[PDB]
Amino acid sequence: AQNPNCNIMIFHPTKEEFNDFDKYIAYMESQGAHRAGLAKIIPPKEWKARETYDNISEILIATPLQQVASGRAGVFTQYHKKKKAMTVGEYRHLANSKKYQTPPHQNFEDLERKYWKNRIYNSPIYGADISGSLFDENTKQWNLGHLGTIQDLLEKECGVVIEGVNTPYLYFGMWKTTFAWHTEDMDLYSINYLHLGEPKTWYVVPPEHGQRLERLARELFPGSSRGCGAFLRHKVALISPTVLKENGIPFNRITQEAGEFMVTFPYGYHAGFNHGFNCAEAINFATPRWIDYGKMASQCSCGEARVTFSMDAFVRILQPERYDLWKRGQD
Ligand SMILES: O=C(O)CNC(=O)C(=O)O
Ligand SMILES: [Mg+2]
Ligand code: NI
Ligand SMILES: [Zn+2]
């Protein structure tokens, strides 16, 4: 069995190996990468996402989100308070302001310590989930706006043609902006490219151990757990590495830098934070191996999780018994 300890693996594809996306995902899996829940892919030196980032300041962040925490330093929830629209250039200035800028630090480890110690006492503003792409149309390899669609994958594997579309999203981050513990919608894969700026630290639980994290989360957020049998789908709960280690939950950590891809695998729980001003692009995707995870994915039916148009067909086709309840939660 490859990668039996479920370590995060890092890949350095050649330019030739970077041509066929599906093939390379399958190669990584042949080496056990999925066991970790997360892999890093460093693109060949010949590759570029686009020529420059000099012209991105006019992009609009229509609904910047201020991430307000409640709880204790290692165990908290966050809610998103909507703020007035601002451009990327306005957001970058805000991120770099004394109120929001990254503090002096020695190295990633020192910054990580500062994050866990101090995150709850601040409310950073995140430009998340902005439909769009920063890949040049002429970038043919690993261009997140030109991947095979999940609807086409389900059609190819199962024979059923469905409605829906699959497009990427931009994330503009600052110091302490946070992504809560989650798996993807319908336990899909995700791929994330860090276009520019400061790093992003990830934490991940191996898919084979995801239920351990769920059980801890029910313990730690007991009101939330009573409200919803899949409340991690709400994407509001944080648990620190220290707390995870105290409770024996298997996990790993890695820092992604600008110019690097991360792939999250089906049912790989992940969480993390941004080091300073940055811009990432991410999209969900599927492979044949995903279908079995999609059929077994938990779902939130309490109303909170509220998701894209395109999840309807996945639930309807893969989870017909759950569909009527889930759709009531949509409505
Ligand atoms: O970058 C972020 O804020 C969150 N990204 C992901 O959860 C992802 O790419 O799957
Ligand atoms: Mg612009
Ligand atoms: Ni994710
Ligand atoms: Zn719910």
Pair 268, 37: CB distance under 8 Å: yes
Give distance in angstroms: CA of 141 to centre of ligand 3.
Answer: 22
In this structure, the residues whose C-beta lies within 6 A of any atom of ligand 1 are 171, 179, 190, 192, 264, 270, 280, 282
* 209 annotated ligand-binding residue: no
Range list of β-strands (E), the chain = 9-11, 38-41, 60-61, 65-72, 75-82, 86-87, 125-131, 169-173, 178-182, 189-197, 200-205, 237-239, 252-256, 261-264, 269-274, 278-285
Q: How was this structure determined?
A: X-ray
Q: How would DSSP label each residue in 212-228?
A: HHHHHHHHHSHHHHHH-
Q: How many CB atoms lie within 10 A of CB 276?
A: 20
* 246 annotated ligand-binding residue: no
DSSP H or E segment with residue 25: helix 21-30
Best CATH choice for the domain 1-331 from the list 3.10.580.10, 3.30.1330.10, 2.60.120.650, 2.60.120.380: 2.60.120.650
Structure tokens given for 33: 């990468």
Give distance in angstroms: CA of 48 to centre of ligand 2.
Answer: 19
Sole residue written with tokens 């995707």: 285
User: Please, what is the angle between helix 150-158 and helix 311-318, to 10°?
Assistant: 20
Q: For the chain, which residues make up each domain, given as ranges?
A: 1-331
Among protein residues, the one with the nearest Cα to ligand 1's atom 2 is 179
255 DSSP 8-state letter: E
Which strands, in side-by-side order, build the sheet including 252-256?
178-182, 269-274, 200-205, 252-256
**Residue of 144, 147, 190, 260 to test ligand 1 pocket, by largest number of atoms within 8 Å of CB:** 190
Pair 38, 9: CB distance under 8 Å: no
Give distance in angstroms: CA of 261 to centre of ligand 2.
Answer: 23
Pair 279, 134: CB distance under 8 Å: yes
Resolution given for this structure, in angstroms = 1.5
Q: How far apart are CA 287 and CA 103, in angstroms?
A: 41
Neighbours of ion ligand 3 (CB under 5 A): 190
Bridge partners of residue 252, in order along the sequence: 204
Q: What are phi and psi of 39, to 5 degrees?
A: -135, 155
Q: How many CB atoms lie within 10 A of CB 109?
A: 10
Query: For the range 18-26, what are the long-range contacts, defined as Cβ-Cβ under 8 Å and sequence gap of 24 or more?
Result: 18/43, 18/44, 18/47, 18/141, 18/142, 19/140, 19/141, 21/141, 21/142, 21/147, 21/148, 22/148, 22/287, 25/189, 25/263, 25/287, 26/287
Q: How far apart are CA 25 and CA 48, in angstroms?
A: 19
Q: Tell me the pairing of strands 60-61 and 86-87.
A: antiparallel
Give distance in angstroms: CA of 116 to centre of ligand 4.
Answer: 26
Among protein residues, the one with the nearest Cα to ligand 1's atom 10 is 190
* 235 annotated ligand-binding residue: yes
Ligand 1 atom nearest the C-alpha of 192 is: 9
Q: What angle do CA 156, 165, 327 make, to 5 degrees?
A: 95
Query: In a 10 Å sphere around its CB, with 0-12 CB exposed, 13-18 middle and 19+ buried, how is residue 100 labelled?
Result: buried
Pair 87, 58: CB distance under 8 Å: yes
Pair 186, 297: CB distance under 8 Å: yes
Q: What angle do CA 205, 208, 214 make, to 5 degrees?
A: 60
Structure tokens given for 117: 């110690």
Ligand 1 atom nearest the C-alpha of 191 is: 9
